[PDB]
Design an enzyme around this catalytic site. Structure first.
Site, PDB file in Angstrom:
ATOM      1  N   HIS A  25       0.714   7.613   2.241  1.00 56.93           N
ATOM      2  CA  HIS A  25      -0.520   8.336   2.537  1.00 56.93           C
ATOM      3  C   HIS A  25      -0.466   8.928   3.935  1.00 56.93           C
ATOM      4  O   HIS A  25       0.388   8.512   4.742  1.00 56.93           O
ATOM      5  CB  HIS A  25      -1.745   7.400   2.502  1.00 56.93           C
ATOM      6  CG  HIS A  25      -1.716   6.324   3.559  1.00 56.93           C
ATOM      7  ND1 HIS A  25      -0.876   5.216   3.487  1.00 56.93           N
ATOM      8  CD2 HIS A  25      -2.395   6.207   4.725  1.00 56.93           C
ATOM      9  CE1 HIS A  25      -1.061   4.476   4.567  1.00 56.93           C
ATOM     10  NE2 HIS A  25      -1.944   5.076   5.354  1.00 56.93           N
ATOM     11  N   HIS A  28       3.130   7.620   5.751  1.00 55.64           N
ATOM     12  CA  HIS A  28       3.638   6.260   5.935  1.00 55.64           C
ATOM     13  C   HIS A  28       3.141   5.353   4.810  1.00 55.64           C
ATOM     14  O   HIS A  28       2.198   5.715   4.089  1.00 55.64           O
ATOM     15  CB  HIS A  28       3.231   5.748   7.315  1.00 55.64           C
ATOM     16  CG  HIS A  28       1.753   5.759   7.586  1.00 55.64           C
ATOM     17  ND1 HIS A  28       1.032   6.910   7.860  1.00 55.64           N
ATOM     18  CD2 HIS A  28       0.860   4.738   7.622  1.00 55.64           C
ATOM     19  CE1 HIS A  28      -0.237   6.583   8.053  1.00 55.64           C
ATOM     20  NE2 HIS A  28      -0.371   5.272   7.879  1.00 55.64           N
ATOM     21  N   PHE A  49       0.890  -1.204   0.000  1.00 54.33           N
ATOM     22  CA  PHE A  49       0.000   0.000   0.000  1.00 54.33           C
ATOM     23  C   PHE A  49       0.913   1.235   0.000  1.00 54.33           C
ATOM     24  O   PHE A  49       1.908   1.277   0.740  1.00 54.33           O
ATOM     25  CB  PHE A  49      -0.939  -0.027   1.229  1.00 54.33           C
ATOM     26  CG  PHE A  49      -2.125   0.941   1.157  1.00 54.33           C
ATOM     27  CD1 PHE A  49      -3.186   0.709   0.324  1.00 54.33           C
ATOM     28  CD2 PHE A  49      -2.158   2.071   1.931  1.00 54.33           C
ATOM     29  CE1 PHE A  49      -4.257   1.614   0.290  1.00 54.33           C
ATOM     30  CE2 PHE A  49      -3.249   2.948   1.856  1.00 54.33           C
ATOM     31  CZ  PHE A  49      -4.244   2.694   1.080  1.00 54.33           C
ATOM     32  N   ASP A  85      -3.297   9.263   7.191  1.00 58.59           N
ATOM     33  CA  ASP A  85      -4.532   8.610   7.585  1.00 58.59           C
ATOM     34  C   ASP A  85      -5.736   9.569   7.586  1.00 58.59           C
ATOM     35  O   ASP A  85      -5.592  10.749   7.931  1.00 58.59           O
ATOM     36  CB  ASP A  85      -4.435   8.010   8.968  1.00 58.59           C
ATOM     37  CG  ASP A  85      -3.664   6.660   9.012  1.00 58.59           C
ATOM     38  OD1 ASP A  85      -3.249   6.125   7.956  1.00 58.59           O
ATOM     39  OD2 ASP A  85      -3.485   6.055  10.087  1.00 58.59           O
TER      40      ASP A  85
HETATM   41  C1  W05 Z   1      -3.196  -0.343   8.396  1.00 54.62           C
HETATM   42  C2  W05 Z   1      -3.885  -0.821   7.122  1.00 54.62           C
HETATM   43  N1  W05 Z   1      -4.229   0.265   6.208  1.00 54.62           N
HETATM   44  C3  W05 Z   1      -5.460   0.756   6.058  1.00 54.62           C
HETATM   45  O1  W05 Z   1      -6.452   0.316   6.630  1.00 54.62           O
HETATM   46  C4  W05 Z   1      -5.689   1.892   5.100  1.00 54.62           C
HETATM   47  C5  W05 Z   1      -4.652   3.000   5.190  1.00 54.62           C
HETATM   48  S1  W05 Z   1      -4.634   3.712   6.871  1.00 54.62           S
HETATM   49  N2  W05 Z   1      -6.959   2.522   5.341  1.00 54.62           N
HETATM   50  C6  W05 Z   1      -7.944   2.625   4.440  1.00 54.62           C
HETATM   51  O2  W05 Z   1      -7.854   2.168   3.284  1.00 54.62           O
HETATM   52  C7  W05 Z   1      -9.186   3.304   4.941  1.00 54.62           C
HETATM   53  C8  W05 Z   1     -10.245   2.287   5.354  1.00 54.62           C
HETATM   54  C9  W05 Z   1     -11.561   3.006   5.737  1.00 54.62           C
HETATM   55  C10 W05 Z   1     -12.724   2.075   6.104  1.00 54.62           C
HETATM   56  N3  W05 Z   1     -13.059   1.255   4.902  1.00 54.62           N
HETATM   57  C11 W05 Z   1     -13.877   2.887   6.630  1.00 54.62           C
HETATM   58  O3  W05 Z   1     -14.937   2.977   5.995  1.00 54.62           O
HETATM   59  O4  W05 Z   1     -13.800   3.476   7.706  1.00 54.62           O
HETATM   60  C12 W05 Z   1      -2.982  -1.793   6.434  1.00 54.62           C
HETATM   61  O5  W05 Z   1      -2.939  -1.790   5.194  1.00 54.62           O
HETATM   62  O6  W05 Z   1      -2.302  -2.582   7.094  1.00 54.62           O
HETATM   63 FE   FE2 Z   2      -2.293   4.322   7.329  1.00 55.64          FE
END
Ligand code: W05
Ligand code: FE2
Length: 329
Positions: free
Chosen positions: A212, A268, A209, A214
């Site tokens: 970005h 991150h 990923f 958060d």
């Molecule tokens: C930490 C985790 N990353 C993540 O979860 C990533 C980046 S923080 N976050 C997202 O895509 C947002 C999810 C929002 C969720 N569907 C909602 O509706 O609230 C990973 O990839 O390990």
């Molecule tokens: Fe994140």
């Protein structure tokens, strides 16, 4: 030659109690961490994370393809137009490795006023059949309240750190209306691991990923004990150590807005690792109409030239923008 980032372990247990001087000493540590890399591990948090991991593993390894389509969000199943956030996010074998299950506030029931009004970002959770997954819904709902409690305590420490009363953030973080979410993410081991599911950073690092900030006030994250996260610093990207006993905490872009970037939302990314592992974030989101007036702790009068932004507006804009930038997850 990729060194580790400074991520302190902070004992947050005083934040649950009534020793005010002890709470200030925790708040100082939170301040220091937030002004340096932006990350810290919360220890002595009171949550049974081993059990959390076990229950989550049992769910991920037993759900079937039929169940996944039946729970799928609208990005994967056109018949489910009300599921934008809550539900199953499928993997695409040969192309996308990760899969996950998202749920929201258990109080968002069919009779909740925001559900009746059809306000954006509020949905009623979907769950798999009880006989196929005994006890899962009940466990997952209790977990939401356990991490909600830890988060309320953390928000007390952030408020004190910023020179405010302890309820400054927490008063807007309420069981009846929080837009907070839990995401149960599975990152699989695969042999061979498809190249199409691996991205590449400008510096050559293989990623799952991309970079970005958060979309949250703060993020409260449990992960398996396999190192994977990196934070951008003065000296390039640096590795965040894993610790599957603590919760990894960072600020999201709403905190940055409110504080005029005194507490930045750290940039991150997630490295590609060929390992079967879990990533279980809790995104601390406020209410749809919550508004905190922005301030600046580096200024004598504390005034800021940023304008107030309601949480609901921030969140819907943020989630869509993150999908556009880094893809559907
Ligand atoms: C930490 C985790 N990353 C993540 O979860 C990533 C980046 S923080 N976050 C997202 O895509 C947002 C999810 C929002 C969720 N569907 C909602 O509706 O609230 C990973 O990839 O390990
Ligand atoms: Fe994140």
């Amino acid at each position: 030659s990729v060194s580790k980032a400074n991520v302190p372990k902070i004992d947050v247990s005083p934040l649950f109690g009534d020793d005010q001087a002890a709470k200030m000493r925790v708040a100082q540590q939170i301040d220091a961490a937030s002004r340096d890399t932006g990350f810290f591990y919360a220890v002595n948090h009171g949550i049974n994370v081993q059990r959390l991991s076990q229950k989550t593993k049992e769910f991920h390894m037993s759900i079937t393809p039929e169940e996944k389509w039946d729970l799928a969000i609208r990005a994967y199943n056109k018949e489910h137009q009300d599921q934008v956030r809550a539900g199953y996010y499928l993997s695409i074998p040969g192309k996308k490795a990760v899969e996950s299950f998202c749920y929201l506030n258990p109080n968002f029931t069919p009779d909740h006023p925001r559900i009746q009004a059809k306000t954006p970002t509020h949905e009623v959770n979907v769950w798999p059949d009880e006989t196929k997954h005994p006890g899962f819904q009940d466990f997952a709902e209790q977990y939401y309240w356990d991490v909600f409690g830890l988060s309320s305590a953390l928000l007390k420490g952030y408020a004190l750190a910023l020179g405010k009363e302890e309820n400054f953030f927490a008063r807007h973080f309420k069981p009846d209306d929080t837009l907070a979410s839990v995401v149960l993410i599975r990152y699989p081991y695969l042999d061979p691991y498809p190249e199409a599911a691996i991205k590449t950073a400008a510096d050559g690092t293989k990623l799952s990923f991309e970079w970005h900030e958060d979309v949250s006030l703060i993020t409260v994250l449990y992960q398996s004990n396999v190192q994977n996260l990196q934070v951008e610093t003065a000296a390039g990207y640096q590795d965040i150590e894993a610790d599957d006993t603590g919760y990894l905490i960072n600020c999201g872009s709403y905190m940055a807005h409110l504080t005029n970037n005194y507490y930045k939302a750290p940039i991150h990314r997630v490295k590609w690792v060929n390992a079967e592992r879990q990533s279980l974030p809790f995104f601390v989101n406020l209410g749809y109409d919550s508004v905190i007036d922005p301030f600046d702790p580096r200024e004598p009068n504390g005034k800021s030239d940023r304008e107030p932004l309601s949480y609901g507006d921030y969140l819907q804009n943020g989630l869509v923008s993150l999908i556009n930038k880094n893809g559907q997850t």
